């Protein structure tokens, strides 16, 4: 079983894709869900219109 990197990528790429799928699922559900803010979150300071 020749283990050249390009041909070995055949075995490696599927496992890497599965691991990436698990990692991205975890990242979407928890990381972004807890750290990111959607729809241009910002702080608004109001001021009254003076006489």
């Amino acid at each position: 079983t020749f283990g050249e990197l390009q041909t070995a990528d055949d075995y490696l790429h599927v496992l890497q894709l599965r691991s990436q799928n698990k990692w991205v699922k975890n990242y979407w559900n928890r990381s972004l869900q807890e750290t990111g803010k959607t729809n241009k979150a910002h702080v608004i300071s109001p001021q009254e219109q003076l006489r």
Partner: protein, 109 residues
């Protein structure tokens, strides 16, 4: 703290009041919110920056559309009466100097 600071605190407070914006300090003294947005520190500074001119305008309007106040008039003419009140005397002395005796008492006309 018992013999100097009690007597020195009023002087420092007066100096700070003269050298600082009383309205802005009063706004910053009250911290928190009661249920309305805009009571934070950032908004208060923004409000006060315009409240300077707003208060100027309100005082001018009061001096015009309300009965004149002696304190307000004295504040308006403070320089002419507080720090430069001897210029009135010097001008009167100069005006009357023609028929006075000062020219014989080490004074020019």
């Amino acid at each position: 703290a018992n013999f100097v600071i009690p007597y020195l605190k009023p002087v420092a407070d007066f100096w700070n009041s003269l050298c600082i914006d009383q309205h802005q300090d009063s706004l910053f003294q009250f911290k928190g919110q009661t249920g309305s947005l805009g009571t934070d520190w950032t908004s208060k500074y923004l409000r006060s920056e315009q409240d300077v001119y707003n208060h100027k305008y309100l005082q001018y309007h009061k001096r015009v559309h309300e009965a004149p106040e002696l304190t307000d008039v004295i504040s308006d003419n403070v320089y002419r009466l507080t720090l430069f009140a001897g210029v009135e005397r010097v001008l009167s002395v100069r005006q009357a100097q023609a028929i006075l005796k000062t020219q014989f008492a080490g004074a020019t006309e």
